[PDB]
Structure formats: structure tokens, C-alpha cells
Swiss-Prot record, chain A:
Free-text note regarding domains: The SANT domains may bridge the nucleosomal substrates and the demethylase KDM1A.
Entry protein name: REST corepressor 1
Localization: Nucleus
Gene it is expressed from: RCOR1
Oligomeric and partner information: Interacts directly with GFI1 and GFI1B in a RCOR/GFI/KDM1A/HDAC complex. Interacts with INMS1. Component of a BHC histone deacetylase complex that contains HDAC1, HDAC2, HMG20B/BRAF35, KDM1A, RCOR1/CoREST and PHF21A/BHC80. The BHC complex may also contain ZMYM2, ZNF217, ZMYM3, GSE1 and GTF2I. Interacts with REST. Interacts with the SMARCE1/BAF57, suggesting that the BHC complex may recruit the ATP-dependent chromatin-remodeling SWI-SNF complex. Interacts with SOX2. (Microbial infection) Interacts with herpes virus HSV-1 ICP0 protein; the interaction leads to the disruption of the BHC complex, thereby preventing the BHC complex from repressing transcription of viral genes.
Residue stretches making up the SANT domain: 70-121
Similarity annotation: Belongs to the CoREST family.
Role noted for this protein: Essential component of the BHC complex, a corepressor complex that represses transcription of neuron-specific genes in non-neuronal cells. The BHC complex is recruited at RE1/NRSE sites by REST and acts by deacetylating and demethylating specific sites on histones, thereby acting as a chromatin modifier. In the BHC complex, it serves as a molecular beacon for the recruitment of molecular machinery, including MeCP2 and SUV39H1, that imposes silencing across a chromosomal interval.
Any one GO biological process: chromatin organization
Residue span relative to the full protein: 312 to 443 of 485
Coiled coil: 23-58
UniProtKB/Swiss-Prot annotation, chain B:
UniProt organism field: Homo sapiens
Domain description: The SWIRM domain may act as an anchor site for a histone tail.
Protein name: Lysine-specific histone demethylase 1A
Reaction equations catalysed: N(6),N(6)-dimethyl-L-lysyl(4)-[histone H3] + 2 A + 2 H2O = L-lysyl(4)-[histone H3] + 2 formaldehyde + 2 AH2
Coiled-coil segments on the chain, per record: 257-343
GO molecular function list: chromatin binding; DNA-binding transcription factor binding; enzyme binding; FAD-dependent H3K4me/H3K4me3 demethylase activity; flavin adenine dinucleotide binding; histone demethylase activity; histone H3K4 demethylase activity; histone H3K9 demethylase activity
Superkingdom field: Eukaryota
Entry EC no(s): 1.14.99.66
Phenotype upon changing G89R: In AIMAH3; uncertain significance
Cross-link (Glycyl lysine isopeptide (Lys-Gly) (interchain with G-Cter in ubiquitin)): K332
Cofactor(s), names only, from the UniProt record: FAD
């Protein structure tokens, strides 16, 4: 029931009146606390400003052009050999494997796993990828 | 309504009997509701007839002829009600033409100390009741703290000048009996900071509102946190205001710390994000170089060389996608951080100019209570608040002294007679007084009863101005110690021409420091002739009493010259400065509810003193020493109407004692 925007906790009233010079001590430590928070903002601004200066140039010198490839249903020998290496490197990450081959959907990759499971020792290859 | 208005104008509930009435009509208040309603109508209608014409005595026969059935059937009841109202001063008080001339046989002898308003009102009553009354007055005039300066056409009040609302106010009746020129006080009151410039309306209103909120806060502090004793002493209004202000200053700093901490938290979240990006950029830079080398192994290549190009390509675009998301998050954080950097909470609770204008409002409260806020009881300082009259405040244009002078007509008043000693025993009283002009002339007044209306300041005096033999009991002297008696002074400035705003009755001067906030803080334009009154309140009151009039008037003219211009303010033709604390017949201005006191001390002040028996084993004596004055009336202290009411009370009490009820 205090007036709106007035602030009067029992806790604070006792803190400002427990001692003859309690109030000024309270407001003093709050002042110094604000000084050390502003000091700390200055350090992080200056630290962040140096980091931004390293990101000058973005990653634009390093972005490759994006090629779209018509997703083909048929597996050339070359595309099979890519997939086996992609399995060796990426494991069950069907998305990464699709991106490497370029013309094979995530489903076609997953289906490839079953059909050539036997002929390509795909189980051995997954075990091989797990050792590192 | 009419009979209902009569009750309201007599400060009575119209539909209920009071404790006083219960005491004189126990048969009625303990009896059926129907008779109580009949009683209440008789009382309200008798009050009404009196109020509708307070210039002539309302007699019992007159009252009865005006009552109509069924109410005029119980003539004993009507006569009882009329006698009760008359005896207690609710009808036929003040100055009225008497139908039945006063009987020559007087009964009992009363000495009244003091011929201020309380003493005079009691005296008029007691004489109306058939007693022999003499007033002893130390000054060379009546009125006491109603004190009007008169010189030429200049008229200005050095003491009381405001009649509060007329609704319920007994001064309403008096004003129909005396030619008082009452004039409304327009409460518009511009403030001028110490540089003579006006306070902008924006600021005048912000700070006044904050002033009102700080008061509510102290009351919350008092009633909800029970902050009423601190380090074994009663908390004062001023002290509670300090705590409230400290906490508002604390909250501003708490709010700043919370805000800059949100900026730190965000900055650090950004720092962590940038480090993530810088490392990712390097990882991307190195990965590109690898994709570049592998793709420069020119075809035709075996399928591992092809896989190297295509998987470096894949890894690089993924890292680029990861980097693009981190850079989207970076722009959102820099947004959040630019909004925070633009929403800073308030810098200060109050600027220096604010706190000065605030001090003016505190000085205004110190004026109304005639005392520094550090002396006011936090718990009780506004205890008479529920009794405020209704209507506009008014000034007495022809000088408030017209009231005590009018009341004094017909009374036996010994001016220039300072009471030195009050003797009261089971057989009667002796009042010993001296001539103030030559103190060697001693006077003895013997009487059945003494009504003491000495100001609370005089009762407080150590060593005493007035000795009571036997000494007042401790329950009364302790009350006298606890009660506050404050101080307030006025500077009357009489010019030959009006240079202020004539349509503005008040204007303020905002002092530069808290210490000086009460010093000449308020000016009044109230009179027909060009007169300004300037107030000295709070801590300034007592200090300015030890400064010469020429310096005080100089400070006044300096303030006014700053507000209105140096060429606009001529020298005053006449000036007067009050020094009420130094006045030995007052020793202050009026009472206040001090920290450590309360409303019950006003009841204690009002209680009469009863001496012990002369012969031991003799029956209980009657009371001999009575008290009135503004310090004796709980619900209307520190006013003229309170003093008048207190005299009416004591006269009923004394007459009941010595004439019978
Ligand atoms: C500056 C000032 C401003 C005020 N403004 C407000 C206002 O505007 N309106 C309002 O309603 N009230 C106001 N008051 C208060 C009001 O004036 C008083 O409460 C009231 O007038 C006092 O009445 P009283 O009869 O109790 O005491 P007083 O009028 O003080 O009467 C006591 C009398 O006893 C005399 N006396 C003292 N010692 C002795 C002695 N030893 N022997 C004999 N006689 C003695 C005194 O001289 C005096 O005449 C103001 C008062 C002052 C001083
Ligand atoms: O000039 C003296 C002021 C006397 C005074 C003392 C009171 F205790 C109550 C009053 F009504 C009053 O007079 C008008 C007033 C009212 C509110 C604030 C300030 C003054």
C-alpha cells in the first residue's frame, strides 16, 4: 500500500536507520558499485571493438558459389565411390553425404545404405568411422 | 436539510446522541429509539432557530412556541434540551441582544486569567449564567494572540488572520454578530526561486505532487511498518521524511545498477559471440585454402582426389552457414545493446532546484504547524484532521481584533495586571497579581474558582512566570512538558502603492538552503490598503527574532526587488515585526503535537484541579482551578475557534459546578 512509485520495504527502512550514518554508507556503496559497473562496460566495449576489427571483411573472400544440381535417380560408379567415402568421413549424417555427391537426395542416400550394405561392407565402414 | 444542517453547523451528528448528551439525558439514550429521535429533533430544531438568528437570545418559551406537535407535547423534555444547549454554549453564545435583562443577584465569584478569546468567551458565558466575573490581563489590550496592528489606514494582523471554512465553525455565528469583513483567500500562489524568476508550471506541479507523495509515504511508514520509535525515541515527521527521501535516492541508484548490469550482461554475451566468430572466420579461411589446393589438382583425378574437392566444398559451405547465423545473432545483440544504451533510468531523485522548491513546501508545512518538522509527532501530527470545517478559508479585512474587542463589551477587565501566583484550597482561591507598569502595586483577588487561560508557552516557563500554590500535580505538569509550543512570525510592510499582482493573495519565495527555507518564504496580499505580510516559519522563526527590524525589512525588500524590479519597490511607509517567542505573555505562537505527545495531552490540559481537604477527614472538595485556551481542546487546537470553544466548555463546566445543572 505505498504511493505508486514510492519505494519503502521494511528491509530497506531498517538498513537506512540501523545506524547514525547508515544511509550515507548505503548510498556511498551504491555509487561506487555503479562506478565499477561502468568501468567494466568500458573494458568490454573496447575488447569487443578490437574483435569487430578482426572480422573486417566478413567471410566474403571465402564463400563459394552455390551450384544447384538436378537430383538424379541413377547411381554412377563415381557417385557410389563418393558415397562410400562420405560414409567413411561423415557416418550416418545423411545430409552431409547428399551434399557431397550433389545429385542424390537424403532418401536416396538412406536407401543406398541398405542396398549396398552387403557389397560395400557399409557396416565395416561405419565401424571404421567410429574409431576416430 | 435544515434541522440536519443545524446539527452539522454545531459539529454534532444529526442522527445520533453524543457522549455529552448521554451524560445529561441517560434516560433517553438508554430508552426506546422513538424518544431518541424526538430528542434529536428538538435539539436540531433548537440549534436551527438559534443559528437562523444569532443576534437575539433564543429563550425556552420562544423555542416551544416554534416547535409543532408531537414535539412540543413534552415541555419538560423541551426545557431540558434548551437548558442543555444554553449551558454548553451551543445557543446564546457570543454577542446577542438579551430579551430578559441580566438579573442583579449574582452567584459565585470567578477570576479569569487572560482575556484572549478563550478567556473572553468563558467570561461572557459565566456572566450570562449569573456569576460575578473578573478577567485579569497582563497586556494593555484584549485579544491575546489576536493582535491587530492599526496605524492610519493601515490594518494588519500580527497573530491570527485566517478564518478556516465556515461550515461547522463557531466563528460563522460570531461573524453574523460582529462586523467582520470576511474575504475569500484565492489559493493561487506563484513561487519565485531566489533569483526572482518564477518557477515554471511544469516544475511547480511535479514537486508539489512529490511533496504530497512523500507525506503519504511517511504515513505508510507510520501505519504499516510501525516506524514510530527509533533508538528508543519517538520518530518525528521530519525524520520520517528523511528516511523516505533516502529510500527514493536509494531506489534511483538501485535502478541505475540494474540497468548498467543489463548492458554488461549483453556486452559479455556479445564478447562470447565475437570470439566464436573470430575463430570460425580463421577456420573458414584455412578451409578455403584447402579447397583451393584440392581443386587445383587438375583433372582427370582419381575418386579420392574428387572426394577431397567435394567434401572440402561441403565442409566450407557448412561453416559459412554457421558463420552467417552467428552474424545474424550479432546484429540482434547490437540492437538490444543500442536500445538499452537509449533507455537510461533517471539520473537523480531530485535536482538542486527540485529540492529547493521541495523545501518551500516543507517550510509551508512548518508554517501551518508553527514548528520545525523535526519536532512533529509522526504518529499524531495530523490528529485533528478529521474535524476540518468545510468552505473556503477567509481573512478578516478589517483586522481580527474586532472579535475580542466586541466580546469584551460589558465585562470587568483589569488590563496591565500580571498574575504572579494562583492559590487554591478547599475553601476558595486567591489570585495575586501586580501592575505591569509598576510591579510594586500588588493585588489580591479572592474567588470561588479560577479559570486559567495562560498560553501553553507561559505554563512551560522555567523558572515560572506564574506560581501555583499548591503546585500543579505531575499529571498536569508532565502534559505541559510533553506538548509542543511553536513559533511563527510576521513582517508587516506598508507601502503607498501596489506593485504586486493585485489578484493574487499569496506568493512564495524559494530559499536557497534547507536551513533558511522558512525565512520570508511566503507573502500575503490581504488588505484594502497596500500591505504585504511576510512569514517567518520553522527554524527561521526563532533565529530571526534576534535580528533587528531594519535588517529583516531589508531582506524583505531585497526579495521583492528581485521578483518585481528594483525601481518598482519603494521603501515602506510603516513596518512591524512580530517576535512571539520573546513575548512574555505568549512565549510562542500556538501548540503542536510534539513527538512523544498525543491528543490525550490536550485532554489532560483541560482537566480541572481539585484541592485536598483543609481539615483532614473532611468531605471531598469541589474542583477549584479550571483551564481553557487553544492548548486545551483536542479536536481544534491552535486556532481561534478552538480557543472560543474551550471557553464555552469551561463556562458550562464551572456553572454546572457552582450553580448546579
Ligand atoms: C502568528 C500567529 C498566527 C496565527 N494564525 C492562525 C490563524 O490565522 N487563524 C486561527 O484561527 N488561529 C491562528 N493562530 C492561533 C490563535 O491566534 C490562538 O490559538 C488564539 O488566539 C489563542 O487564544 P487563547 O485565548 O487560548 O490564548 P491567548 O489569546 O494567548 O490569551 C491568553 C491571554 O493571557 C494573557 N496573559 C499571559 N500571561 C499572563 C499573566 N501572567 N497574567 C495575566 N494575563 C496573562 C495574554 O497576554 C493573553 O491576552 C495564530 C496565532 C499566532 C500567534
Ligand atoms: O496565521 C496563523 C495561522 C493560524 C492557524 C493555525 C492552525 F492550527 C490552524 C489554522 F487553520 C490556522 O490558520 C489558517 C491555516 C490553515 C492551514 C495552514 C496554515 C494556516
Amino acid at each position: 500500500k505505498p504511493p505508486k512509485g514510492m519505494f519503502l520495504s521494511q528491509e530497506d527502512v531498517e538498513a537506512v536507520s540501523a545506524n547514525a550514518t547508515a544511509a550515507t554508507t548505503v548510498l556511498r556503496q551504491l555509487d561506487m558499485e555503479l562506478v565499477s559497473v561502468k568501468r567494466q562496460i568500458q573494458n568490454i566495449k573496447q575488447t569487443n571493438s578490437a574483435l569487430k576489427e578482426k572480422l573486417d571483411g566478413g567471410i566474403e573472400p571465402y564463400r563459394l558459389p552455390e551450384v544447384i544440381q538436378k537430383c538424379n535417380a541413377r547411381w554412377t560408379t563415381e557417385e557410389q565411390l563418393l558415397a562410400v567415402q562420405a560414409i567413411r568421413k561423415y557416418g550416418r549424417d545423411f545430409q552431409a553425404i547428399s551434399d557431397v555427391i550433389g545429385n542424390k537426395s537424403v532418401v536416396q542416400v538412406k536407401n543406398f545404405f541398405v542396398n549396398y550394405r552387403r557389397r560395400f561392407n557399409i557396416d565395416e565402414v561405419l565401424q571404421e568411422w567410429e574409431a576416430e | 436539510s435544515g434541522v440536519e444542517g443545524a446539527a452539522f453547523q454545531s459539529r454534532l451528528p444529526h442522527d445520533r446522541m453524543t457522549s455529552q448528551e448521554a451524560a445529561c439525558f441517560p434516560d433517553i439514550i438508554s430508552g426506546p429509539q422513538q424518544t431518541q429521535k424526538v430528542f434529536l429533533f428538538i435539539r436540531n430544531r433548537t440549534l436551527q432557530l438559534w443559528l437562523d438568528n444569532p443576534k437575539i437570545q433564543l429563550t425556552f418559551e420562544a423555542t416551544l412556541q416554534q416547535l409543532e406537535a408531537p414535539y412540543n407535547s413534552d415541555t419538560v423534555l423541551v426545557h431540558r434540551v434548551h437548558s442543555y444547549l444554553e449551558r454548553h454554549g451551543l445557543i446564546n453564545f457570543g454577542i446577542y441582544k438579551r430579551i430578559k435583562p441580566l438579573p442583579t443577584k449574582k452567584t459565585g465569584k470567578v477570576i479569569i486569567i487572560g482575556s484572549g478569546v478563550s478567556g473572553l468567551a468563558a467570561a461572557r458565558q459565566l456572566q450570562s449564567f449569573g456569576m460575578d466575573v473578573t478577567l485579569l490581563e497582563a497586556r494593555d489590550r484584549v485579544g491575546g494572540r489576536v493582535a491587530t496592528f492599526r496605524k492610519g489606514n493601515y490594518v494588519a494582523d500580527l497573530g491570527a488572520m485566517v478564518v478556516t471554512g465556515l461550515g461547522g465553525n463557531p466563528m460563522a455565528v460570531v461573524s453574523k454578530q460582529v462586523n467582520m469583513e470576511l474575504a475569500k483567500i484565492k489559493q493561487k500562489c506563484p513561487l519565485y526561486e531566489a533569483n526572482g524568476q518564477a518557477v515554471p508550471k511544469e516544475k511547480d506541479e511535479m514537486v508539489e505532487q512529490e511533496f504530497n507523495r512523500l507525506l503519504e509515504a511517511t504515513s505508510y511508514l507510520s501505519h504499516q511498518l510501525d516506524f514510530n520509535v527509533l533508538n528508543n525515541k519517538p520518530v518525528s515527521l521530519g525524520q520520517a521524511l528523511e528516511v523516505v527521501i533516502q529510500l527514493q535516492e536509494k531506489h534511483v541508484k538501485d535502478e541505475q545498477i540494474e540497468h548498467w548490469k543489463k548492458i554488461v550482461k549483453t556486452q559479455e554475451e556479445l564478447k562470447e559471440l565475437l570470439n566464436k566468430m573470430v575463430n570460425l572466420k580463421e577456420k573458414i579461411k584455412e578451409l578455403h585454402q584447402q579447397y583451393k589446393e584440392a581443386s587445383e589438382v587438375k583433372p582427370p583425378r582419381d575418386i579420392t582426389a574428387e572426394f577431397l574437392v567435394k567434401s572440402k566444398h561441403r565442409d566450407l559451405t557448412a561453416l559459412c552457414k554457421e558463420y552467417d547465423e552467428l552474424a545474424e545473432t550479432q546484429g540482434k545483440l547490437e540492437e538490444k545493446l543500442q536500445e538499452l544504451e537509449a533507455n537510461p533510468p533517471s539520473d537523480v531523485y531530485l535536482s538542486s532546484r527540485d529540492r529547493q522548491i521541495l523545501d518551500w513546501h516543507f517550510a509551508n508545512l512548518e508554517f501551518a504547524n508553527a514548528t520545525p518538522l523535526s519536532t512533529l509527532s509522526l504518529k499524531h501530527w495530523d490528529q485533528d484532521d478529521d474535524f476540518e470545517f468545510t468552505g473556503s478559508h477567509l481573512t478578516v479585512r478589517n483586522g481580527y481584533s474586532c472579535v475580542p474587542v466586541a466580546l469584551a463589551e460589558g465585562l470587568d477587565i483589569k488590563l496591565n495586571t500580571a498574575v504572579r501566583q494562583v492559590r487554591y484550597t478547599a475553601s476558595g482561591c486567591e489570585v495575586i497579581a501586580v501592575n505591569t507598569r509598576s510591579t510594586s502595586q500588588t493585588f489580591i483577588y479572592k474567588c470561588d474558582a479560577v479559570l486559567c487561560t495562560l498560553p501553553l508557552g507561559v505554563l512551560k516557563q522555567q523558572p515560572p512566570a506564574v506560581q501555583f500554590v499548591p503546585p500543579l500535580p505531575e499529571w498536569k505538569t508532565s502534559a505541559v512538558q510533553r506538548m509542543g509550543f511553536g513559533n511563527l512570525n510576521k513582517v508587516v510592510l506598508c507601502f503607498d502603492r501596489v506593485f504586486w499582482d493585485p489578484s493574487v493573495n499569496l506568493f512564495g519565495h524559494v530559499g536557497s538552503t534547507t536551513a533558511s527555507r522558512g525565512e520570508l518564504f511566503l507573502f500575503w496580499n490581504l488588505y484594502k490598503a497596500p500591505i504585504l505580510l511576510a512569514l517567518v516559519a520553522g527554524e527561521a522563526a526563532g533565529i530571526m527574532e534576534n535580528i533587528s527590524d531594519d535588517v529583516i525589512v531589508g531582506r524583505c525588500l531585497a526579495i521583492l526587488k528581485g521578483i518585481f524590479g528594483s525601481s518598482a519597490v519603494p521603501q515602506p511607509k510603516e513596518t512591524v515585526v512580530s517576535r512571539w517567542r520573546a513575548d512574555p505573555w505568549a512565549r510562542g505562537s500556538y501548540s503542536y503535537v510534539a513527538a512523544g505527545s498525543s491528543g490525550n495531552d490536550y485532554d489532560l490540559m483541560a482537566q480541572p484541579i481539585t484541592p485536598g481537604p483543609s481539615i483532614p477527614g473532611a468531605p471531598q472538595p469541589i474542583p477549584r482551578l479550571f483551564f481553557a485556551g487553544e492548548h486545551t481542546i483536542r479536536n481544534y487546537p491552535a486556532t481561534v475557534h478552538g480557543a472560543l470553544l474551550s471557553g464555552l466548555r469551561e463556562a458550562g463546566r464551572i456553572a454546572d459546578q457552582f450553580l448546579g445543572a
